[PDB]
Amino acid sequence: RGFYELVYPPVDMYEEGGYLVVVADLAGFNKEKIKARVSGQNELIIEAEREITEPGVKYLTQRPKYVRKVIRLPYNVAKDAEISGKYENGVLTIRIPIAGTSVIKIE
Amino acid sequence: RGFYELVYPPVDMYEEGGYLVVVADLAGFNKEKIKARVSGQNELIIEAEREITEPGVKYLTQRPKYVRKVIRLPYNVAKDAEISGKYENGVLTIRIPIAGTSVIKIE
Amino acid sequence: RGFYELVYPPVDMYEEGGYLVVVADLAGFNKEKIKARVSGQNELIIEAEREITEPGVKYLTQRPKYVRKVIRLPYNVAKDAEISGKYENGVLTIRIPIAGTSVIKIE
Amino acid sequence: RGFYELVYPPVDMYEEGGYLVVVADLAGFNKEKIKARVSGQNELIIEAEREITEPGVKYLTQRPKYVRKVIRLPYNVAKDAEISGKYENGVLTIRIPIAGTSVIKIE
Amino acid sequence: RGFYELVYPPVDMYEEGGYLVVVADLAGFNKEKIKARVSGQNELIIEAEREITEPGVKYLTQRPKYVRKVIRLPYNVAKDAEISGKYENGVLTIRIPIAGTSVIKIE
Amino acid sequence: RGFYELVYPPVDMYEEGGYLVVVADLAGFNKEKIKARVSGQNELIIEAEREITEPGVKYLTQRPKYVRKVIRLPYNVAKDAEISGKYENGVLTIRIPIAGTSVIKIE
Amino acid sequence: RGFYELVYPPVDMYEEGGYLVVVADLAGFNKEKIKARVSGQNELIIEAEREITEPGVKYLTQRPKYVRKVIRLPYNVAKDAEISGKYENGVLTIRIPIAGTSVIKIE
Amino acid sequence: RGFYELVYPPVDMYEEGGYLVVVADLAGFNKEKIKARVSGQNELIIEAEREITEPGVKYLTQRPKYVRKVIRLPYNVAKDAEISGKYENGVLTIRIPIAGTSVIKIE
Amino acid sequence: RGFYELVYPPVDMYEEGGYLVVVADLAGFNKEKIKARVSGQNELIIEAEREITEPGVKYLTQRPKYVRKVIRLPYNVAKDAEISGKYENGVLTIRIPIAGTSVIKIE
Amino acid sequence: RGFYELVYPPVDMYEEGGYLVVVADLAGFNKEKIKARVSGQNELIIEAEREITEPGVKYLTQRPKYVRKVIRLPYNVAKDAEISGKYENGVLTIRIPIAGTSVIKIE
Amino acid sequence: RGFYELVYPPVDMYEEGGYLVVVADLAGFNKEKIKARVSGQNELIIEAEREITEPGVKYLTQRPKYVRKVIRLPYNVAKDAEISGKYENGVLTIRIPIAGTSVIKIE
Amino acid sequence: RGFYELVYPPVDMYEEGGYLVVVADLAGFNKEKIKARVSGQNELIIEAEREITEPGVKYLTQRPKYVRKVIRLPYNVAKDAEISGKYENGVLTIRIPIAGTSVIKIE
Amino acid sequence: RGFYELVYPPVDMYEEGGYLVVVADLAGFNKEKIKARVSGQNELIIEAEREITEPGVKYLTQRPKYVRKVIRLPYNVAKDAEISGKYENGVLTIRIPIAGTSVIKIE
Amino acid sequence: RGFYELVYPPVDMYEEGGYLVVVADLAGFNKEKIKARVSGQNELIIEAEREITEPGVKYLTQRPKYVRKVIRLPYNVAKDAEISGKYENGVLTIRIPIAGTSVIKIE
Amino acid sequence: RGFYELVYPPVDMYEEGGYLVVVADLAGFNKEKIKARVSGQNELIIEAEREITEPGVKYLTQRPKYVRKVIRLPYNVAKDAEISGKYENGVLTIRIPIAGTSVIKIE
Amino acid sequence: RGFYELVYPPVDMYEEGGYLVVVADLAGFNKEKIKARVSGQNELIIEAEREITEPGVKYLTQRPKYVRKVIRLPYNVAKDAEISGKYENGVLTIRIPIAGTSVIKIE
Amino acid sequence: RGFYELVYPPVDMYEEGGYLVVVADLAGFNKEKIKARVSGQNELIIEAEREITEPGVKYLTQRPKYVRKVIRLPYNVAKDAEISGKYENGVLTIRIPIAGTSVIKIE
Amino acid sequence: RGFYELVYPPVDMYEEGGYLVVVADLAGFNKEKIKARVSGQNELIIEAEREITEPGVKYLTQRPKYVRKVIRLPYNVAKDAEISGKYENGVLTIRIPIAGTSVIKIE
Amino acid sequence: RGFYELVYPPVDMYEEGGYLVVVADLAGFNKEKIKARVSGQNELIIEAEREITEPGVKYLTQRPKYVRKVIRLPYNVAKDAEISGKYENGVLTIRIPIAGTSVIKIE
């Protein structure tokens, strides 16, 4: 519950041949109580929450219940398809359709 | 791979009726390639590593492959039993025997 | 009329099962001379004004006649329905339709 | 519940022909759960409280349940009459008897 | 030609019963060599230029030939009508249609 | 009415073959309600005023009604002739006789 | 590979009678391995990459393999036509359709 | 024409088995209007120039016409052979003879 | 005997339905050698003293023999009744009559 | 509950002829809900907790429910005997065996 | 054309038995394109200009085309005679009549 | 004789088709009492001196009798020919042979 | 003999499958006049010394005769075996037994 | 009794062929009222005290009665033998057994 | 030999019924190789020296061989008698005659 | 691989009766993969490289693979003879001919 | 006993026709337990002491028992006569003989 | 031996009709143990050394045994003749041939 | 003549078995035009002067003609004997009688 209500989550993204994709850890949290979403086509949406109220002595439980950090998207995508999301062992990865009419005249 | 080779993992500990215990996230990493350890009875030992080399475009993969942070123990325990460790969905929790002859004369 | 032409109003918002909602005080001001509006779907609009010109001695009337403070919205909503607004005893609350196709693939 | 447990209420006072008077907003709060008081004749007394515990998502409910700010009186009044107080739509106004033997010899 | 290539023009705007309007000086410059425009519905567009090359001694001609300063709009308007612009004696004023479905539920 | 009761007008001057001259903008203001003057032969005199009291909503009318800025003259002129002044479209220009016995012995 | 992974490329743009245009160097890089794109109609998109791994001694190869710098557009254009791009000898120039209904009422 | 009359060109050098070599970009500029040179055997000489005078609106043409930056040589070479220079697509590369009697007694 | 001749005692107060009350620790000190008092009706009074002269080696006896800290009262009380005081196990609590004619006209 | 969750407890220690001893206040807390302990032979261990949740008006209850502060021991002792502890009226004193083979060769 | 548009010219003045005089360098500039003048009787006036537009490579031409620096006069002189000026080899000297009724009663 | 024993002379150089050249003012000083020189082929040499001892009142004769400032040469020249120097009206210009085997392989 | 009596030696360590190991330079010094040691199982021990008294002119002999720098060990080892040390060509490497009962319960 | 209750004693130590040893002044104090000790094998223990209460006028008696300063040991020794200590004329020196199995494999 | 060639010796002085006296430590140094003296009647004189050249390993021998610090005298004495000096166990005390005609007219 | 890519190597130089000489450590690196050189007669040249890529756990391998630091020479030497170099056990020493016509007229 | 062991006494001196004199307060202190003196002829001597050990509660007894401050004399006097001293009601004044051969040749 | 190993020698040079010359003190040092030299034609060479090891008490012997300070030459000279050097009574002066072909074309 | 009119001369002093002595350089100055002296018995006296008026070009003659720096004496001497002074080759040394009744009672 430390300053960690801001610091998390982990940043990770790249590209899958027409799939921008994303990655970030999510341990000890069902693939149900999690929430996905859509926003302006060029922004991030992350919410969800569990509850591990400090039990015994409670020393330095610098571990929250839910955090959030927006991060506008590079060149957007094509808001209409399906937000292909997933999760397993923590790997809370996704998928991006990625518009084809991107790389116009190069020559 | 950002300054995240220091910042992670998540801090979380308390007590289980004679079991100090611990908690910290571990997503996308087998309960095998993980390593536990013993050290002076009042310190921390954490290592292990996977490998998700940045695939496609690689934007800001501020997500390492392995990190570590030592944290001496309160009043130690009783180094002799078994380092009751575990893991599932990220929850890389443990168990502490906790010595019985702790709270001496109070009155 | 103090630096209060910036400081007010009070911040308060949450969620009503598909209704983002809002709250904020509005004392001594009719539910007529108030103004609502629409803007970019992800921003705030607040105007209106009364007039309590300092009467007698006028000591430190640090209380304005009208203020305003924009605050872009989380993930917008679905600009088309009706800006369900209200007011009574000061409670200048509202309602938000909130799009249903929000939380896409979680698993 | 933000730093607003100090910032509010609104400052407003003047004079009503022998009635110093006062003004300050009070929205969403009965004219019952409100409290008035007397103190040394040249100070302020304000207390009371409701309870709008953050409902749903709870974003930035920077709106307390009860605040207070003392402000000594100019030249006091004549502690004996009745603290003519009132309230409606937020306007939590009052009345001051104001002593008659104030402006002594001027010429 | 001083730091004046940034400082000018003069800020002035208000409202005309459903017409946001604007004002700003424009001396020594035809109502032809001036340029108007449209942009994101919530931003400003100002360009145009003349040429009074310093003649004789040229002392401190801190007066440019053309300047520009963007200023996003309050709540936009309704980009479709005509950018009712004008000019005379310098008064480079305009007109704004202003959408009617602005002030929704007040009560 | 912003800090613009100081910043304006625009600086512009040079020379017209024995006519130092001057230039500065003047939009939305008659060539009547304008005032000229004489002063010590090496200083500036500028006054006049109109009145565009903020109409509707009044946002940021950072445009005064009258400003002034003195600026001593280079080598003065020959206070006796006529302060050849003018105005049209804003261009509030003038004319300077300029003394002939200026450039004395050069060789 | 110096701080040059940010510093480059060269800024250059102007206008071609209804064609905003752009310019910027691109030496030692095919007109194939380059990438163009579309984004929010008022932003920049630049990616592409080669590979000149430091050969011999490798002294101060402060020259990257690929860089990027976004720069929102003035007043956008009309996203629908073709991103008329090109390249030769480094000159990585383009073309902009530029909407005609730009300069509305001037008089 | 920005502070770019200093910042450019790009730094790049290494070794070609007895050929120190060099690299740096040169787009939009003939392999004729370019100039090479010799100097003290341990310094740099770079000059040349084209001319793309800002055409239309001219926004931020932070792109010069000619720049220069000296950089003494490591251990010089053997000033006598030929300054094997070249150019194509921007790659303005060169060649260095490199003296053979360099690495004297090592053992 | 450290900077603790100022730092102590512990702050604690609230209300007992017409009894403002107080709380603050008092260990190793008799309920006799303690002193209570009255002062202006809106201030604090605390004195008393024992004596534990550093015995043996005397390391960091950062523990005084007597301290004091004044804290004016909110709205005073009704100086006339009895300063209902007490003490046991350290708990040096008290009682306040609290005037009844406090909360005047609320409506 | 002020910064007092650190500041307390009071420091006091000396020696009792082969008994280092300790002293520190403990008011309003049973000699049962207190906790003692052993740690590395040269450190401190202090925990326990009650609960006096602010009752009525709650002004400045700058008094915690539980605090802790470690302070390594001088030359340790001889961890094996019994942590002779006690408590009464707040006086939470202890006892130390103190090894006899301390003061070796002096002459 | 460096900061030299201020720094120059050279300061030099003294006295010639009733002739204050002046001195200052003037190379590469005709005794025709130079300008002299009169001003308030206690100030300086210096203007003129040639033109040596940087020819070839233009390295650091820190040499202007025209500069000016005012320097009020000691006790003035007697504005009426002739500004006895001259020039040769750069030496742009002058002459001052100097009033005779200067040194009044000394004894 | 002010800080001018450093500040002067005036910087000016360029190129004359195979003649780097130089320029710098020299007033009130013969084309004899001046000194030229040679130095390392890439440095400057300037000395000489007259004498204008402050005559009369001597006010602020911030004008030296002789100064000097070194400025290494770009790429040197070909030390062997004649330091083609000159002077007239102040203009203390020169000439440089400039080596022909300068611009080696460009293509 | 410069600040180098602290700066050296070179840091280098890793792991050899159950052998933590170490590395650090040691030139111009016999594999005899060197000293190894044991210390608390989690610290470093380095001493030894030669002697190269500055011979001739002695310029900047910023080279000591002996240095030392402690660096506690990660998790210690198992102090009992033999401090398997060595040396050749400078390479002053070692070997560590490394306890086997290190990585306890992982799953 | 000046800041001298920290500053003293004097530091002095070296080695006696397998006897680390120590040195430090001790004037005006018996070889009886002095104390020696054992601690963790790698730390220092120093206590003892006389008493020279300032007699007459007492000027700047910056001379304490007892001081202490810990200084962990290099590589410890072999806690078991006898703390060979002494004292005479002030010289409060000692003796260290020093373990023989220190300098392991050097070659 | 650290900064201890200044810091030492210990300050200590008072009065012995007509004997100002002095005190200071002197360990490990004969009552022969010490030096006393006389100076201006109101200043200090301290010199002497032994020699304990660092023997073995020499760690931090922050202990000099000789130091000195002057300290003028209060009201001097009566330079004529004998500088009654002594020493034993370190105590290097002295004696002062002290003039009798000191305390003149008090009443 | 720490900041050690600069810090190293060790400085050491003197003189050998007509041989300036040099010294600097070189452990773990063949007398083959090292490189020597000549440069301007008054500078340094040092390059070469091995490769000890961090093996196991890789803790703080603050040891590079190759470093370099230039240091102009005192009075040079006489570039023509042979750069008498060597190496053994790390000792990467050299030899300097040293010109004989150095110490000219002394008397 | 506050910082008053320095601040006091009061400065006061002047002249009595050949008697420099002095003045300063001395309350609550006999004209016996006071001390006078002689020193270098140009310095001050002040000592004496009583004893008012804080009695009851002892609040802020910022009043010492004895203080002293030296202040060299202007031009001394003639050390030989009698230190004419006195005291009464606090006034601890004195007398100075003052040498007659002071004011030598004036004309 | 103070910071004097940098500060000395004394700077002194001028010109002897085609003999630049030099001057600097040299006391207590033979005209034999002194050294002269040649270097790049435009730099300084100064070495030599005696030895006056502090004899008796050694107070502040801020007088070295040998110092050096380089100072490149104005325009060099003509390296070939003889370094005409000398010395007597300290005066360690010299002589410079000075090239004749220095002052080229002046007119 | 630089800041050298303070910096010089060289500090050097010690002792000659009852002869404090002194040393300092004195080049280029007769053993006649030098001045010695006596002062308060505990201060320094140094004056004398030659004259080497900068001859030729005069570059940086940072060498004065005479300097002086006082330095009170340790414990004075015995002002009565003869100021045994000398000089030769610069060495301007002296001699001190040194009082015998210096080192009084040591034991």
Topology:
This is part of a larger assembly, with 19 copies of chain A (about 110 residues).
Chain A: H1 4-7, E1 34-35, E2 47-48
Antiparallel strand pairs in A: 1-2
3D structure, described in words:
- This is part of a larger assembly, with 19 copies of chain A (107 residues).
- Chain A has 107 residues and is mostly loops.
- In chain A, 4% of the residues lie in helices and 4% in strands.
- Chain A is built from one helix and two strands.
- Chain A has one helix spanning 4-7, and strands at residues 34-35, 47-48.
- Chain A has a two-stranded antiparallel ribbon with strand order 1-2.
- Chain A is elongated.
- The relative contact order of chain A is 0.29.
- Chains A and B meet through loops of A and loops of B.
Jot down its keywords.
part of a larger assembly, 19 chains, 107 residues, little secondary structure, two-stranded antiparallel ribbon, 1 helix, 2 strands, Small heat shock protein StHsp14.0 (chains A, B, C, D, E, F, G, H, I, J, K, L, M, N, O, P, Q, R, S), A-crystallin/Hsp20_dom (chains A, B, C, D, E, F, G, H, I, J, K, L, M, N, O, P, Q, R, S), stress response (chains A, B, C, D, E, F, G, H, I, J, K, L, M, N, O, P, Q, R, S), HSP20-like_chaperone (chains A, B, C, D, E, F, G, H, I, J, K, L, M, N, O, P, Q, R, S)
